[PDB]
From a paper:
The ferrous iron and 2-oxoglutarate (2OG)-dependent [name] prolyl hydroxylases (PHDs/EGLNs) catalyse trans-4-prolyl hydroxylations on [name]α subunits, thus promoting their binding to the von Hippel–Lindau protein (VHL), a targeting component of a ubiquitin E3 ligase, and signalling for [name]α degradation under normoxic conditions. The PHD-catalysed hydroxylations of [name]-1α/[name]-2α in higher animals occur in amino- and carboxy-terminal oxygen-dependent degradation domains (NODD and CODD). The three human PHDs exhibit different NODD/CODD selectivities, with PHD3 being substantially more selective for CODD than PHD1/2 (refs 16). Biophysical analyses employing crystallography and NMR reveal that the molecular basis of PHD isoform and variant selectivity involves enzyme–substrate interactions involving β2/β3 loop residues (that bind the LXXLAP motif) and helices α3 and α4, regions which display sequence variations between the PHD isoforms.
Numbering used by the authors: 188 to 404, 408 to 411
The structure:
Protein backbone atom coordinates (compact mmCIF):
# COMPACT_ATOMS: atom_id res chain seq x y z
CA UNK A 1 0.00 0.00 0.00
CA UNK A 2 1.55 3.34 -1.07
CA UNK A 3 2.78 5.51 1.80
CA UNK A 4 0.95 8.56 0.43
CA UNK A 5 -2.39 6.72 0.33
CA UNK A 6 -1.99 5.52 3.90
CA UNK A 7 -1.01 9.05 4.95
CA UNK A 8 -3.82 10.95 3.22
CA UNK A 9 -6.64 8.45 3.63
CA UNK A 10 -5.83 7.30 7.18
CA UNK A 11 -2.92 8.82 9.16
CA UNK A 12 -3.84 12.48 8.61
CA UNK A 13 -7.61 12.22 9.31
CA UNK A 14 -7.11 9.86 12.25
CA UNK A 15 -4.36 11.98 13.85
CA UNK A 16 -6.34 15.20 13.53
CA UNK A 17 -9.47 13.52 14.92
CA UNK A 18 -8.05 11.18 17.59
CA UNK A 19 -4.32 11.90 18.04
CA UNK A 20 -3.75 8.12 18.25
CA UNK A 21 -3.43 6.08 15.04
CA UNK A 22 -2.78 2.34 14.54
CA UNK A 23 -1.61 0.77 11.26
CA UNK A 24 -1.50 -3.02 11.18
CA UNK A 25 0.67 -5.08 8.82
CA UNK A 26 2.90 -2.09 8.05
CA UNK A 27 5.83 -3.78 6.30
CA UNK A 28 4.66 -7.38 5.89
CA UNK A 29 5.79 -10.67 7.38
CA UNK A 30 9.13 -11.04 5.57
CA UNK A 31 10.36 -7.56 6.48
CA UNK A 32 8.87 -7.64 9.98
CA UNK A 33 10.62 -10.93 10.71
CA UNK A 34 13.94 -9.57 9.46
CA UNK A 35 13.59 -6.57 11.78
CA UNK A 36 12.81 -8.99 14.61
CA UNK A 37 15.97 -10.94 13.80
CA UNK A 38 18.10 -7.79 13.89
CA UNK A 39 16.63 -6.68 17.22
CA UNK A 40 17.14 -10.13 18.72
CA UNK A 41 20.73 -10.14 17.42
CA UNK A 42 21.35 -6.80 19.15
CA UNK A 43 19.94 -8.27 22.36
CA UNK A 44 21.92 -11.50 22.08
CA UNK A 45 25.21 -9.68 21.42
CA UNK A 46 24.85 -7.41 24.46
CA UNK A 47 24.02 -4.12 22.73
CA UNK A 48 21.14 -3.24 25.08
CA UNK A 49 21.52 -1.66 28.50
CA UNK A 50 20.96 -3.86 31.55
CA UNK A 51 17.56 -2.26 32.17
CA UNK A 52 15.88 0.55 34.07
CA UNK A 53 16.56 0.28 37.79
CA UNK A 54 13.09 -0.47 39.17
CA UNK A 55 13.68 -1.79 42.69
CA UNK A 56 16.86 -0.83 44.54
CA UNK A 57 17.47 -3.43 47.25
CA UNK A 58 19.89 -3.27 50.16
CA UNK A 59 21.41 -6.35 48.51
CA UNK A 60 22.29 -5.21 44.99
CA UNK A 61 22.29 -8.81 43.74
CA UNK A 62 18.50 -8.64 44.17
CA UNK A 63 18.00 -5.38 42.24
CA UNK A 64 15.07 -5.46 39.82
CA UNK A 65 15.71 -3.94 36.40
CA UNK A 66 13.15 -3.35 33.68
CA UNK A 67 13.10 -1.96 30.14
CA UNK A 68 16.44 -2.23 28.31
CA UNK A 69 17.30 0.14 25.46
CA UNK A 70 19.73 0.74 22.65
CA UNK A 71 19.93 3.72 20.29
CA UNK A 72 20.09 2.86 16.58
CA UNK A 73 20.94 5.29 13.78
CA UNK A 74 19.96 2.76 11.10
CA UNK A 75 23.27 2.49 9.20
CA UNK A 76 25.05 0.19 11.65
CA UNK A 77 26.13 -3.30 10.58
CA UNK A 78 23.29 -5.71 11.31
CA UNK A 79 20.66 -2.94 11.57
CA UNK A 80 19.86 -2.22 7.92
CA UNK A 81 16.28 -3.47 8.06
CA UNK A 82 15.80 -1.28 11.15
CA UNK A 83 17.14 1.53 8.96
CA UNK A 84 14.66 0.57 6.26
CA UNK A 85 11.88 0.79 8.85
CA UNK A 86 13.08 4.24 9.89
CA UNK A 87 13.15 5.42 6.27
CA UNK A 88 9.62 4.04 5.84
CA UNK A 89 8.41 5.95 8.90
CA UNK A 90 10.05 9.08 7.48
CA UNK A 91 8.34 8.61 4.10
CA UNK A 92 4.96 8.44 5.83
CA UNK A 93 5.59 11.56 7.91
CA UNK A 94 6.90 13.38 4.84
CA UNK A 95 3.65 12.64 3.01
CA UNK A 96 1.77 14.02 6.03
CA UNK A 97 3.71 17.27 6.34
CA UNK A 98 1.53 20.36 6.59
CA UNK A 99 -1.47 18.20 7.50
CA UNK A 100 -0.65 17.05 11.05
CA UNK A 101 -2.28 19.98 12.77
CA UNK A 102 -0.32 23.13 12.03
CA UNK A 103 2.98 21.39 12.90
CA UNK A 104 5.91 21.49 10.48
CA UNK A 105 8.06 18.42 11.10
CA UNK A 106 11.71 18.95 10.16
CA UNK A 107 13.65 16.27 12.01
CA UNK A 108 13.56 13.26 14.27
CA UNK A 109 15.55 11.35 16.86
CA UNK A 110 17.53 8.19 16.31
CA UNK A 111 15.54 5.01 16.93
CA UNK A 112 15.15 3.88 20.52
CA UNK A 113 14.86 0.09 20.54
CA UNK A 114 13.29 -1.10 23.80
CA UNK A 115 13.14 -4.59 25.29
CA UNK A 116 10.89 -5.35 28.24
CA UNK A 117 12.52 -8.61 29.38
CA UNK A 118 9.34 -10.37 30.55
CA UNK A 119 10.00 -10.18 34.30
CA UNK A 120 6.75 -8.44 35.22
CA UNK A 121 8.15 -4.94 34.70
CA UNK A 122 6.37 -2.21 32.76
CA UNK A 123 6.71 1.54 32.40
CA UNK A 124 5.06 4.07 34.72
CA UNK A 125 2.47 6.53 33.49
CA UNK A 126 4.23 9.45 31.78
CA UNK A 127 4.12 12.08 29.03
CA UNK A 128 6.83 11.78 26.37
CA UNK A 129 7.30 15.56 25.92
CA UNK A 130 5.96 17.41 28.95
CA UNK A 131 8.10 20.58 28.84
CA UNK A 132 8.15 21.64 25.17
CA UNK A 133 11.35 19.91 24.04
CA UNK A 134 10.27 19.94 20.38
CA UNK A 135 8.88 16.42 19.95
CA UNK A 136 5.35 16.50 18.51
CA UNK A 137 4.75 12.93 17.21
CA UNK A 138 5.70 9.57 18.75
CA UNK A 139 6.03 6.67 16.30
CA UNK A 140 6.33 3.08 17.62
CA UNK A 141 6.81 -0.16 15.65
CA UNK A 142 6.11 -3.48 17.42
CA UNK A 143 7.75 -6.82 16.61
CA UNK A 144 6.11 -9.45 18.85
CA UNK A 145 4.58 -12.38 16.97
CA UNK A 146 1.33 -13.87 18.28
CA UNK A 147 1.34 -11.48 21.23
CA UNK A 148 -1.66 -12.08 23.50
CA UNK A 149 -2.01 -9.53 26.29
CA UNK A 150 -4.43 -11.76 28.19
CA UNK A 151 -1.47 -14.10 28.69
CA UNK A 152 1.63 -11.88 28.44
CA UNK A 153 0.40 -8.43 29.52
CA UNK A 154 2.48 -5.61 28.10
CA UNK A 155 -0.47 -3.51 26.90
CA UNK A 156 0.26 0.11 26.05
CA UNK A 157 -2.51 2.09 27.75
CA UNK A 158 -3.06 5.71 26.69
CA UNK A 159 -5.28 8.13 28.64
CA UNK A 160 -6.38 10.68 26.02
CA UNK A 161 -6.83 14.08 27.64
CA UNK A 162 -10.39 15.00 28.57
CA UNK A 163 -11.93 11.55 27.97
CA UNK A 164 -13.24 9.17 30.65
CA UNK A 165 -11.76 6.10 28.98
CA UNK A 166 -8.39 4.77 27.94
CA UNK A 167 -7.12 3.29 24.69
CA UNK A 168 -5.39 -0.09 25.02
CA UNK A 169 -2.95 -1.04 22.26
CA UNK A 170 -1.53 -4.54 22.00
CA UNK A 171 2.24 -4.57 20.96
CA UNK A 172 1.46 -6.80 17.98
CA UNK A 173 3.95 -7.90 15.33
CA UNK A 174 4.21 -5.49 12.37
CA UNK A 175 1.98 -2.86 14.02
CA UNK A 176 2.85 0.83 13.70
CA UNK A 177 1.50 3.48 16.08
CA UNK A 178 1.43 7.28 15.98
CA UNK A 179 0.36 9.59 18.76
CA UNK A 180 0.87 13.19 19.84
CA UNK A 181 3.89 13.30 22.16
CA UNK A 182 2.68 16.12 24.42
CA UNK A 183 0.44 16.18 27.51
CA UNK A 184 -2.62 15.18 25.46
CA UNK A 185 -1.46 11.52 25.62
CA UNK A 186 -0.22 10.34 29.01
CA UNK A 187 0.46 6.62 28.72
CA UNK A 188 1.96 3.57 30.40
CA UNK A 189 3.21 0.07 29.63
CA UNK A 190 1.47 -2.50 31.78
CA UNK A 191 3.64 -5.30 33.23
CA UNK A 192 5.02 -7.61 30.55
CA UNK A 193 5.48 -11.33 31.25
CA UNK A 194 7.12 -12.20 27.92
CA UNK A 195 9.95 -10.57 26.02
CA UNK A 196 8.47 -7.45 24.39
CA UNK A 197 10.29 -5.44 21.71
CA UNK A 198 9.41 -2.05 20.22
CA UNK A 199 11.18 0.57 18.09
CA UNK A 200 10.43 4.26 18.72
CA UNK A 201 11.30 7.45 16.89
CA UNK A 202 10.14 10.96 17.82
CA UNK A 203 9.47 13.64 15.19
CA UNK A 204 10.34 17.30 15.85
CA UNK A 205 8.19 20.34 15.12
CA UNK A 206 10.41 23.04 13.63
CA UNK A 207 9.15 26.00 15.68
CA UNK A 208 9.01 24.21 19.03
CA UNK A 209 12.47 22.70 18.57
CA UNK A 210 13.93 26.03 17.43
CA UNK A 211 12.78 27.78 20.60
CA UNK A 212 13.65 24.83 22.83
CA UNK A 213 17.28 25.79 22.18
CA UNK A 214 16.63 29.07 24.01
CA UNK A 215 15.29 27.60 27.25
CA UNK A 216 17.67 24.59 27.30
CA UNK A 217 21.11 26.17 27.00
CA UNK A 218 25.67 26.48 21.78
CA UNK A 219 28.31 29.04 22.77
CA UNK A 220 30.46 31.21 20.51
CA UNK A 221 33.10 33.82 21.14
O1 LIG B 1 6.55 0.38 24.31
C1 LIG B 1 5.42 0.96 24.36
O2 LIG B 1 4.33 0.51 23.93
C2 LIG B 1 5.38 2.35 25.00
N1 LIG B 1 6.68 2.72 25.52
C3 LIG B 1 6.86 3.94 26.00
O3 LIG B 1 5.87 4.85 26.12
C4 LIG B 1 8.12 4.35 26.41
N2 LIG B 1 8.26 5.68 26.61
C5 LIG B 1 9.44 6.17 27.01
CL1 LIG B 1 9.54 7.93 27.23
C6 LIG B 1 10.54 5.35 27.24
C7 LIG B 1 11.75 5.90 27.66
C8 LIG B 1 12.84 5.08 27.89
C9 LIG B 1 12.72 3.72 27.70
C10 LIG B 1 11.51 3.18 27.29
C11 LIG B 1 10.41 4.00 27.05
C12 LIG B 1 9.20 3.49 26.63
O4 LIG B 1 9.01 2.13 26.41
MN1 LIG C 1 6.35 6.94 26.20
Amino acid sequence: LPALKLALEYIVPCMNKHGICVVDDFLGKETGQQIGDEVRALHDTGKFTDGQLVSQKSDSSKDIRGDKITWIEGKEPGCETIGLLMSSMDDLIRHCNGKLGSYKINGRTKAMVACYPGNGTGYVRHVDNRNGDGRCVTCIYYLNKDWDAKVSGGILRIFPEGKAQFADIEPKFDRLLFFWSDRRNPHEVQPAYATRYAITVWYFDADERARAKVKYLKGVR
